[PDB]
Amino acid sequence: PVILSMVILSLTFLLGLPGNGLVLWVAGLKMQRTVNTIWFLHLTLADLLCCLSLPFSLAHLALQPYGRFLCKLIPSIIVLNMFASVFLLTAISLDRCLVVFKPIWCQNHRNVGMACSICGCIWVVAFVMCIPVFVYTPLVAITITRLVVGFLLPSVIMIACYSFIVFRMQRARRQLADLEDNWETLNDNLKVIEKADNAAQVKDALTKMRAAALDAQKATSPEMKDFRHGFDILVGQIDDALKLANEGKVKEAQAAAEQLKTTRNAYIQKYLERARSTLKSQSKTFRVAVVVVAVFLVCWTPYHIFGVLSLLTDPETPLGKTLMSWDHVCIALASANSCFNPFLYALLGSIQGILEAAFS
């Protein structure tokens, strides 16, 4: 099945250089450097460095043609890019979970300088794990070390961080839904009261409005202060209308209830818009990260599976022949991950709108 590996690798290169170059150039010399975009820039740079080495592997597979370098360094680029990508992805997930975490580690030193320092640290940490591959049974230990460091622990970290993030996103949702329900009963009762004659239905509608307003003010920092002050004014106005309707005046209660609309729009509408806006975006920002992580892991799993199988299985076996036959396909797919990654940005994203907005 060597021809299948050949064709898939050639297709990966043919569609890998253009996309990587386009994304790198658009994200690099268009907008300003921020703590968020820098990580994706580093990830795409590592993927581009990985993609640059494909023709050497193609020549090695096709000819099996000068020097030791064919068997010396170009096999190490896969390990290097895998490790750098894993560490950068776990750093992105850690930061995404940190944003919603305690503010003590949010405003301490969160700056572009810290971002590039941590990126350099990540590159160095990925580098110190590259030496064992290049230099030099060892196969017993090095395969286990790569699997444990590159696959298990970071995947656990991303799973925990994203489970906490989705649990926190599932919570606020309901809270908003409750506030929207209270808003809807307030609005429809205020619509009922205008067309309702008699002094009894006015009191019945105002009782419901008062309960809804109290519940809405209960649901939840000058922002909060202003939000609660608006509802205090709302409840006071409801009381004015209630005490007008109690003494058998209908039109005055109608006007008093009409006065509620001004305060409602002036106070609570802006908070409603902010709550709806913030919840919607964070959804997409988390969506892209989760999809990227899932694609990365599903691309890299066959390689680890075949490594474990080769380590466990004794040689001089036809099953060994099958596994070394399919090793080319496994490595080819692992490398095709690099070409796959840039396309999901446009899938889940004017060039600026489809690329730059995808990170923020």
Residue numbers in the entry: 22 to 85, 89 to 160, 331 to 365, 1001 to 1049, 1060 to 1118, 370 to 439, 449 to 459
Article excerpt on this structure:
Anaphylatoxins C3a and C5a, generated during complement activation, exert their pro-inflammatory and chemotactic effects by activating their respective G protein-coupled receptors (GPCRs), C3aR and C5aR1. These receptors are expressed on various immune cells, including monocytes, basophils, eosinophils and mast cells. Here, we report the cryo-electron microscopy (cryo-EM) structures of C3aR in three distinct conformational states: apo, intermediate, and fully active. Structural comparison of C3aR in the apo, intermediate, and fully active states provides novel insights into the conformational landscape and activation mechanism of C3aR and defines a molecular basis explaining its high basal activity.
Given that C3aR exhibits high basal activity, and forms a complex with the G protein in the absence of an agonist, we engineered a C3aR-BRIL construct, in which ICL3 was replaced with the thermostabilized apocytochrome b562 protein (BRIL) to stabilize the receptor in an inactive conformation. The structure of this complex was determined using cryo-EM at a local resolution of 3.6 Å in the transmembrane domain (TMD). Our apo C3aR structure represents the first inactive state of this receptor, serving as a valuable reference for understanding the conformational changes associated with C3aR activation. In both the apo and intermediate states, H8 adopts a reversed orientation toward the cytoplasmic center of the TMD, a feature previously observed in antagonist-bound inactive structures of C5aR1. Notably, in these inactive conformations, helix 8 (H8) of C3aR is oriented toward the cytoplasmic center of the transmembrane domain (TMD) in a reverse orientation compared with conventional H8 positioning in GPCRs. The ionic lock formed between R3.50 and D/E6.30, a structural feature observed in some class A GPCRs, has been proposed to stabilize the inactive state. However, in C3aR, at these positions, R1203.50 and Q3726.30 are present, which do not interact with each other, as observed in our apo structure.
